[PDB]
Design a protein around this ligand. Structure first.
Ligand SMILES: OC[C@H]1O[C@@H](O[C@H]2[C@H](O)[C@@H](O)[C@@H](O)O[C@@H]2CO)[C@H](O)[C@@H](O)[C@H]1O
Ligand SMILES: OC[C@H]1O[C@@H](O[C@H]2[C@H](O)[C@@H](O)[C@@H](O)O[C@@H]2CO)[C@H](O)[C@@H](O)[C@H]1O
Ligand SMILES: OC[C@H]1O[C@@H](O[C@H]2[C@H](O)[C@@H](O)[C@@H](O)O[C@@H]2CO)[C@H](O)[C@@H](O)[C@H]1O
Ligand SMILES: OC[C@H]1O[C@@H](O[C@H]2[C@H](O)[C@@H](O)[C@@H](O)O[C@@H]2CO)[C@H](O)[C@@H](O)[C@H]1O
Ligand SMILES: OC[C@H]1O[C@@H](O[C@H]2[C@H](O)[C@@H](O)[C@@H](O)O[C@@H]2CO)[C@H](O)[C@@H](O)[C@H]1O
Ligand SMILES: OC[C@H]1O[C@@H](O[C@H]2[C@H](O)[C@@H](O)[C@@H](O)O[C@@H]2CO)[C@H](O)[C@@H](O)[C@H]1O
Lengths: 312, 312, 312, 312, 312, 312
């Protein structure tokens, strides 16, 4: 079940085959066609108008540059183009038809009343065109390349945290020092660094572009509960594994007995952990809000422990 | 070691560079060339004929539409095309030469006796052509895009199941109720939902297209054994991680002692688990059978436990 | 360090050798001597008067029947007997000298100013007499046989309880019943009996006679704490091991899932346990109070547990 | 932070949009342009010259075939091409500007003093050209396709090994044999095979091409330490999960008691494990050295155990 | 609740005070009195006749030597003696009145209709006599010294066995031998001896004399069950702690791998254990049967274990 | 198997029945008889002369006061007495015949060639006499009351130590203190006292009198080994349970992290423990040496542990 944008949200239509994007302008001379992506060209941005009535479940595609709406039709030339009136004509309404396999993030834009499918290709002219819908070719598939969106907030569902694995890792055994009897002080220092892991995986909602850079706190098991470690300021990449460092730091002293040599074993539970979350985004142009649901996953550490003994 | 189809199995030849597929028809006028993929165009489907004798280890490429066989040759024009006789001529026999790195699912189709390599490109004409085999370019590489195949059956090798991790997850501690002494009944309810995981990973045999939708039971650890949970009816995607829900349900009652307050702790072992399997497929056009070996992998839960105590 | 009674507390003086008790009456004719024990003969009861001044650390022995006080002297006949005035004369003051080995609950009654030791024997006349203190014979040793004392109260020091051993004992595994699927009710019953143990061991204070019958609550480990089980009404014997029965009783039901056979494992921690205590006693004749400190020890059971599972 | 090659290291410049590579030759007639990749064409190889002085942080791009250096300029025709003098002119210096999202392994090659960006496209002529830098299109992005590099050595950092999970897997319980009493010999055999896993993941340094085939020892937990298993001779693929087999082999005998039936339980700890490492590479043409840092990850087994008991 | 013998069972009546035994003969001249114990003198043996009717709950004391029955009476001289007719006269019936404290294994023999108590003393004549029952002296107390009884059988209640403690004791770690690689044989020997413990404690039934020598099997925990170790042939002493030796013996071999040094750890669970039992006895003179219930207690060992590993 | 003294070791012969001791002097007038025990009267001390030749396995009883040797004979008056010549006559040789049950620490002194048994009684004259050996009475039994012996040394067999039980006892949980963040010092104090236990039980060798006071170190489990705690200076009593106190003392500090509240859990393993030993004694009069083997037993504590954590 593919994510279709609501009405206030802008996007590009990237063709599978052409690897190029639809434009709609007023001038210059060819008013619609294909172009290499330019993020700053308003030309290439479109939003949808949700059909109602008999058009419920269909969509018109409104140019942001121009305000006009796309059309696909067979007899009258040209077969595709732009036009006023927010879907006045039956030519402006489109069924979104998701593909399968390697086309499962792609979809057709079929206009049913004319039995016509939008076409995006570089091998043949015109590059942006249509085709009889019954004959399905790969160059009829499109994907959404959404407008740049800022990740305002990550809110974890900590109650539903989960430990998927757990093994003790001894950070520093050694740290054992002596002068048999009375004395008074033996001070101990702990500085050990573990490479932890972090992945923000899509689950539902808005499709954040893979690779998107952002910052956030990352989950942590305390002793009986999950919490957010706000200290960790690494740049994450949406949907990819990142690594970060966690340094464990402690100082503690001992000696006060008859005649003993102190040992200090500093130990941690490490293992895989995961936590659901919801991200909150907004359009950088507009302020328009969406959310994304996700599961966060990471190799982590918890329950720092220092154990003190004696020998003779 | 790449998977080469046996004789009854159909496929497209997608070019690395052209991102387009070979066709062979009788009419219209140019009888072989390149086209965007159309699953329903018989045109684009081919099977192999396994060379024997001096041609052992080589292959002819028979058009499904036409019945003719591909050829590559140097002096006589045109250099490539179609012809009768199931590899009558030495021009019809091809060595399949797998690439490396980003071309490791791709291969060349070299015809040795002419020292010639098949070419698939969009930058230069003719698009489908050949080239002297000693000069290796990226546009000589092809991959198999097999015909649509139905996944008839998944059969797990349960004896070889494996737990890769295990930690206790307490589903519901709380569930503790009281009225000090005699009474009679304290009933308890359990409804807790864990997000489980599922991945069907290729290992050997037929190369199922990544993303392929299907349904099956998914493995489970019982107490001393692996078994299949037939309840779970989610749509899987071959070679990708999917998530599903497992709800744990129980009702149990207690009180019958001197003077105690009952507690009920409902607990599960969760962790990663994996199980080999063999899938059985068949051509949707023909009925032709293959198998695929795979390892299934998943975050799961097992050994549901309820523990009852007392307090004063 | 032997227990010497305070001034309000009555006792008999049993001789090691004679196995007979001192009497002091007014009539009949021989006013002091030895007799077989008769609990009701006031004759045989004595209390001490604690020397002060130069007599500090010494004791006079006052007859309860008569009110007079014992004397031991050498030149004047008779060497032992009775007399008025609560230790008026130096002849009435005695050093209590504990024995060793088999005489460590026994002691001499030496009157230092005359250098004379009290004698209790059946082999030679007079049976109750004295002897030069420097020549030590076994028939100069005496022990206290205290008046009958009622055990009014046992107060345990529960904070200082201790588990000396712990092993799980499965009371009833079996208790597993089935009718594969839906149904609704599977009820389970638990009745299992463990032979527990109980010993009230002297530690300090008043020397309760070994074998003394009484009743009390007996300690128990709850989950995080020691408590007194008031239910257990067995007759104990001071300083001896007793056995008692503890029956564990529970009823609980289950079934509510897809298709499972329920198992129920009822289990306990058993092991040795011990708890300090103070007993409070009083004279049955008089009301005079003392205490005894002790450690209580017992094989016991704790943490009753019922664990419910499933099979197919 | 993208990996930029030092001066002795050769590469191709693959365009995002064109999916074609820059060439620079002396003859034939068009001396620079785009071509499909040919690994053996010196034509397509370039190294960088690190700007210094006012050009510090910028780079010239020297042709390996020709020795000349690339230029981008606006007024004078042609806008791009080749020229003598290792960056004599300001036209030869380039800022490398990494992309984001799907372009994060790609970068622009902007020549600042002319305000001009290099262009690689197939939709419009000339295919290799430039464009005003302020108007950013997708066809200005390039990635490095480095020269073939041999993996000479893998050196693990064994002290920093880590167990991320651990569960016991019983390989063979059964293996229990009998003839009640005296006899003498009961011999036992163990042959059990576990499918292990191996992944060499990039972390820092030189960007080894994903899929690169090589051989190496793979880490192992001994009892108190990580070590390299040199036995395992599988072909690995850089940055991808591979599987391999580990067979556990043992023979041991028993019987010598009063009257017992022997049992033998052969058991292993399995679980996920990971270990940092540094790889050492060198150019196949030149011998030029680089390194790559990585974390190795794998499902593994450790601590083989045989436990012998008795029955009657 | 003291053990009173049934009618076919013989005994001596030992006085607390006299430490001497009642006799009844025909000749010589004084026909009843006291004597030092002689096991072979029929003289000193008596059985009881259980009163019925109005004499229910009372007992006559029949001489084994003579067949006559004891009497106690006040007015007529002599006050005690012997007479024909198995309790014809009211003078022959006795209430058995258990003492307390140090007299709790002792009892009075009071003849109620005359209000008279039997007397056993050495300090005054006649030594065997009676006294007005209302005046209670210590020399009226008697205990049973039963006839010699053979212990024919011990039958344990194994289902009700119990582990009161359990800790692992490593018998022999060391036992580790090497010659790095191929070889073939490494044989291992185990001979380790633990001092075990054994106590047969009275619980109910016939009062076996403390110290009684006998032989029997002694309990043992197997793996899931208690069993009798028939091997152990030590002489036990009823009601006392005995020690015995248990030697653990095993031989096992190993080597068959790539390149490893074998270690062998031989280990046992030791701890306290106890088991109810019933003993079966019979008179050595007569064959007359009784039983005794008891709890057996012992420090023991169980679950012998050998664990084999590897090093490099 | 009773302990019979070697030739240099002195003793008294205490009669079971008489509870009196044999004397042999030169004057006054009756030269042998019975007397109440006087430790300082040389009169009452005897050693044995081990028969050889035909007298092997028999013993003469030499008076320490007099140097003469005991005799028992029938026809000639008096039947018992004293005489010169260290067993010149057959009248001076005695078989030691251990009793059973309550007489198992007692024995007869039978002189076989006259068929005569030594007699010790208070009920009949002469008190010290003999009797025809075939008629066995209780007043023919004797026990050894050895001369006062000093306990010079206890040497434990530490390698053969054993833990019979083990449970963790938390001494002080609480000890948790806070001031959220930076600060620097949180110091912790531990003072907790456990009542331990100690019993020196006879096993073999010289029969140390029960109750004998002495001092020694007492065993202790360290971490991997038994050792002697020389600190513990309580007075022990041979063959009886004693109690002593063990105080555990420690001081340790902590804080040095981001923002945590420290907790400190001080814990010990407690449980029963036992260790074989050999004691070395010597005569206080003479210096004559013996040994005693024994098992020492005690409730003890070991492995002191302090565990430090964190909270927010
Ligand atoms: O899916 C689009 C296909 O277009 C086909 O081209 C058409 C052309 O657009 C139209 O004008 C027509 O009259 O002739 C052609 C054939 O119907 C291509 O053949 C095909 O490759 C697809 O791109
Ligand atoms: O790998 C195929 C290469 O083809 C080359 O083009 C050839 C052309 O096909 C042929 O007719 C010849 O005579 O001239 C060209 C050069 O040999 C391309 O140059 C190359 O880019 C590859 O596509
Ligand atoms: O410890 C008492 C001892 O008494 C001794 O008897 C005395 C007797 O009492 C006294 O009158 C004296 O003059 O003669 C005896 C000897 O001194 C016993 O000899 C001794 O057995 C103890 O009982
Ligand atoms: O990023 C490169 C873009 O080039 C544009 O084409 C230019 C052309 O190269 C130049 O000669 C100019 O004078 O006219 C065109 C428009 O400025 C394309 O329009 C664009 O698609 C990009 O490829
Ligand atoms: O419990 C027996 C007591 O007997 C008392 O002696 C009696 C004696 O037997 C009787 O003949 C009587 O007439 O005179 C004595 C006093 O009543 C003892 O006095 C007492 O010691 C007990 O043994
Ligand atoms: O075991 C000793 C027994 O002695 C018996 O007394 C003897 C006495 O010693 C002796 O002189 C003899 O002639 O007459 C008595 C009977 O044989 C006692 O009868 C007995 O009680 C035991 O003490």
């Amino acid at each position: 079940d593919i994510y279709i944008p609501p009405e206030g949200l802008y996007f590009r239509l990237l063709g599978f085959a052409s690897r190029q994007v639809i434009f709609a302008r007023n001038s210059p001379s060819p008013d619609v066609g294909l172009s290499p992506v330019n993020d700053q060209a308003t030309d290439q941005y479109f939003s949808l108008i949700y059909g109602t009535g008999e058009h419920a479940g269909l969509y018109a595609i409104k140019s942001k540059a121009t305000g006009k709406v796309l059309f696909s039709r067979r007899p009258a030339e040209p077969y595709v183009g732009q036009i006023d009136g927010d879907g006045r004509y039956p030519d402006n309404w489109f069924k979104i038809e998701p593909g399968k396999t390697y086309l499962s993030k792609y979809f057709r834009l079929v206009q049913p009343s004319t039995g016509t499918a939008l076409v995006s290709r570089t091998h043949l002219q015109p590059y942006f065109w249509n085709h009889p819908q019954t004959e399905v070719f790969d160059d009829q598939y499109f994907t959404f390349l959404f407008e740049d969106m800022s990740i305002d907030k990550i809110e974890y569902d900590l109650k539903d945290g989960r430990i998927l694995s757990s093994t003790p890792n001894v950070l520093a055994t050694q740290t054992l020092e002596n002068t048999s009897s009375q004395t008074q002080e033996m001070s101990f220092n702990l500085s050990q660094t573990l490479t932890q892991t972090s992945t923000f995986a899509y689950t539902a909602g808005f499709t954040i572009a893979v690779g998107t850079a952002f910052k956030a706190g990352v989950p942590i098991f305390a002793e009986t509960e999950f919490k957010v470690d706000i200290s960790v300021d690494n740049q994450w990449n949406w949907g990819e594994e990142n690594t970060f460092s966690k340094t464990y730091t402690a100082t503690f002293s001992v000696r006060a007995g008859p005649g003993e040599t102190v040992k200090a074993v500093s130990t941690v539970d490490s293992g895989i952990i995961n936590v659901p979350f919801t991200a909150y985004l907004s359009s950088k142009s507009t302020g328009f809000e969406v959310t994304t649901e996700g599961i966060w996953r990471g190799v982590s550490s918890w329950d720092l422990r220092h154990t003190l003994t004696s020998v003779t």
